[PDB]
Amino acid sequence: FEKAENSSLNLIGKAKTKMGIGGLDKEFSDIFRRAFASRVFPPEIVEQMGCKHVKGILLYGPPGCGKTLLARQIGKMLNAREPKVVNGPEILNKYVGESEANIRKLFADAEEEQRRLGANSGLHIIIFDEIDAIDTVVNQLLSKIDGVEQLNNILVIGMTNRPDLIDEALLRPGRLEVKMEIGLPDEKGRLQILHIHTARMRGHQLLSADVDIKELAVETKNFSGAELEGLVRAAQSTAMNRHIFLASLENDIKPAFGTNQEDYASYIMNGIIKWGDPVTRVLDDGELLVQQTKNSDRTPLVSVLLEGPPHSGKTALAAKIAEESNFPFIKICSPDKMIGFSETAKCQAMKKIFDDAYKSQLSCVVVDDIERLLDYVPIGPRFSNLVLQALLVLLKKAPPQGRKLLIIGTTSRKDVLQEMEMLNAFSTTIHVPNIATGEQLLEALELLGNFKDKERTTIAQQVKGKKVWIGIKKLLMLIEMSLQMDPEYRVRKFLALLREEG
Amino acid sequence: FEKAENSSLNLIGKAKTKMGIGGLDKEFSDIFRRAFASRVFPPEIVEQMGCKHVKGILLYGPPGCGKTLLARQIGKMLNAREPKVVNGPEILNKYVGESEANIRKLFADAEEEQRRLGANSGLHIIIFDEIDAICHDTVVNQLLSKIDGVEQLNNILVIG
Amino acid sequence: MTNRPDLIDEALLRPGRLEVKMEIGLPDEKGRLQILHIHTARMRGHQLLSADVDIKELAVETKNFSGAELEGLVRAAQSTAMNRHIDFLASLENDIKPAFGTEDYASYIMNGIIKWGDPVTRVLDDGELLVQQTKNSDRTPLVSVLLEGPPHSGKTALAAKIAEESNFPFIKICSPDKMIGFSETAKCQAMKKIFDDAYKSQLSCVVVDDIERLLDYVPIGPRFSNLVLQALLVLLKKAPPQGRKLLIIGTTSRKDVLQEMEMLNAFSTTIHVPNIATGEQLLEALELLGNFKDKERTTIAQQVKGKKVWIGIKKLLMLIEMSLQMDPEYRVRKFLALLREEG
Structure with a gap:
């Protein structure tokens, strides 16, 4: 039995009736x-x-x-x-x-x-x-x-x-x-x-x-x-x-x-040529810490600080570390995007970049110029409290359970970080020494391949044994300056400028 | 079939046919x-x-x-x-x-x-x-x- | 309606x-x-x-x-x-x-509050003493307590555990993290809203954490937020509506600055949770965590004697984890070296 089109007869019982x-x-x-x-x-x-x-x-x-x-x-x-x-x-x-x-x-x-x-x-x-x-x-x-x-x-x-x-x-x-x-x-x-x-x-x-x-x-x-x-x-x-x-x-x-949208080719602009075996060891150690982030369950949150004098190739190293991580979420944070932002605003951008990270199971966020974000000025000393608090808190912040966050920042000077007491917060600190010996410098020159072999040998003669103090980033600029001179005095110029950057 | 060069007839189906x-x-x-x-x-x-x-x-x-x-x-x-x-x-x-x-x-x-x-x-x-x-x-x-x-x-x- | x-x-x-x-x-x-x-x-x-x-x-x-x-x-x-x-x-x-x-505690006790040391138990029993003090407390309505530890003490997970243990009818966690990027006034405001929320329950517990961090206190200057400090200063003094009561737990990394701002004077009780100075306790913690092999624990045990360790559990676990990723011959030596550098 079946009542007519929605009638008023109340009947009961069972005797009724994937692409793409x-x-x-x-x-x-x-x-x-x-x-x-x-x-x-x-x-x-x-x-x-x-x-x-x-x-x-x-x-x-x-x-x-x-x-x-x-x-x-x-x-x-x-x-x-x-x-x-x-x-x-x-x-x-x-x-x-x-x-x-x-x-x-x-x-x-x-x-x-x-x-x-x-x-x-x-x-x-x-x-x-x-x-x-x-x-x-x-x-x-x-x-x-x-x-x-x-x-x-x-x-x-x-x-x-x-x-x-x-x-x-x-x-x-x-x-x-x-x-x-x-x-x-x-x-x-x-x-x-x-x-x-x-x-x-x-x-x-x-x-x-x-x-x-x-x-x-x-x-x-x-x-x-x-x-x-x-x-x-x-x-x-x-x-x-x-x-x-x-x-x-x-x-x-x-x-x-x-x-x-973020481009690593933007951050690893002149690439890496290793003046020293130690610079490779430092990158590999960074990779090992990344692998550490990848393996650990009880410690899903990682902070690593790498420090070198400005123009030391810190940012680039960080970018490489990011590259070799293969993390599903990789982001890089720079003041460059940030320019002119209200101290509160800077905190807002930070909140957004950190905010996405937590959803992703394994991820790495790179902060360039950590001090820039604090904006320390030696005279003073003047820095902004909210940015600092945000960074300290963010470092000690934990993504929701089942998630891993990895943080890398680059600061040129250790003294700023010690001044803040921020440095204590970091899980680790890694040195990024600029070249100090002549031989190693010569090797960097060989990797870059800029000067002719004979002139390079002359340069080695002028530096081998002696001490030097040039940041890699500086060194490329230096090479360029010297390659603009006549093939005769390309070495005189290089050595003059090196004697100035000593 | 094919519409003339001045027609507005909307035919359907497959029985048809540098400056400056x-x-x-x-x-x-x-x-x-x-x-x-x-x-x-x-x-x-x-x-x-x-x-x-x-x-x-x-x-x-x-x-x-x-x-x-x-x-x-x-x-x-x-x-x-x-x-x-x-x-x-x-x-x-x-x-x-x-x-x-x-x-x-x-x-x-x-x-x-x-x-x-x-x-x-x-x-x-x-x-x-x-x-x-x-693009309030x-x-x-x-x-x-x-x-x-x-x-x-x-x-x-x-x-x- | x-x-x-x-x-x-x-x-x-x-x-x-x-x-x-x-x-x-x-x-x-x-x-x-x-x-x-x-x-x-x-x-x-x-x-x-x-x-x-x-x-x-x-x-x-x-x-x-x-x-x-x-x-x-x-x-x-x-x-x-x-x-x-x-189910x-x-x-x-x-x-x-x-x-x-x-009220999620699972976000604040990431690492099980393992019994590494006699100190852990004593800090917690003292927490028990404090809740018992709250239970009646007609003469004193409001309870103020703080924990002072070396950075990475992990005092905050402990405070959270005390909150779980208490099971008072209303418990709300306070996060530095929510406050981040807030206007000093905004920061004051959220904090205020929590303060009134605490009012509704008859017997009640609230958590304040990383107060030096909460305050935005900075070592150079020193520079700090007068307004934030104010909400903070009055509150301890401030009284809940009659009947209903509250206990405040503050975790502070640095004791002296807080004492310096009269903040210490406010608290009814102050508690300390120092990092282990003993190698064997460190070992016990290692055993509890179960990271190193039964051989490695023995090796660490051999190394620690004649040596003094000053490292935080939060820090220690991080250290452990760091030593572990490297290969097995390496892990023992690396961990020892790492400990040495940290010391």
């Missing part, structure tokens, strides 16, 4: 688990469960994560036809109050469909784009999801770039019981996204042999889905361009990642 | 190439590529770089008729309703023609000047939604 | 049109058991139930949650169970589902 998405799949399973469970079992199980169907679910991800596509896909698959409801970001447009009430009404009809037939089984899914930026409108929206009576048998999903912007009241279980956060796509996940976007191209015979999905994935783990898709889109333009490997290079000349 | 800008040439070609190259090849090549056409191109220049002239030229060159659409910087003028609704409105028509006709072959171009004014609060929020809109919106080109 | 009092108009509130204003209470333990009990019971009534889940246990586990929240927790458990079909589900829901919106 890439990554996030465990998460997808969970979201499926909370919303779908009430609907999926037909039909006594829910009463046995005895839980009113869930009202709404909300998802927030960093931009370009392709939140929207996932929402469209799920909405079409869950119900034969909702059929999908779309919300303009403005939502409320037309400032006359009746109109705003209309913005409410589109929700209002949806609540109503259940009311006419309540029990089973009509489902309407309404999805709001730009839920952030939503007064009377917000309170009003809030009403059309929970209470006064019923309003169940429909579900709403909200997509937004930032969680913090949104109202607290919606979040509590009930109106929005489950909140979903989307991470940057996993490396393996990045490979499903690249693989599936490629695959439509792949499926046709045309392909580029050199390009490799795995290679693209290792190359960027940062990119969000929208973006990864964009990345594949970029490659096409080059082929198309050619008609009127290459794609990877072209890709490099256009990624615009927004997370890959 | 001083300087800016190589760049003009690469910029030309990413938006135009994807769209120009007729017509199977894109599917072989299997890549959805890009939505928009943005150009930023020092003032006096004649950016506006370049924009006019791309508008002339890309379509027999775009037809070109131009947006005032203020955008958000009119307190009463309005600006949000208007933003969606200027955005909406190209998409609707396309949904009615989506596949081929209408591409609509809307041009943006003084973007900094454009919500009105800035509205523009973002149309490009990343849940359903379609491809084949509409915006330059800022 | 409304979520926030503040939004609404003043005129209605005065006795007459709206004489009585009622504010919903924080969920009762017994009450929490009631809201959970109805949903659970309805489930009890049907045959299916989770044996592991206990009503009393869930109630004891959750203090903060609004009603709705209870239905929410239960609902999530039901969804996870459904997932199982295609248990309830545990997974507790693990994820909320989103509760509301």
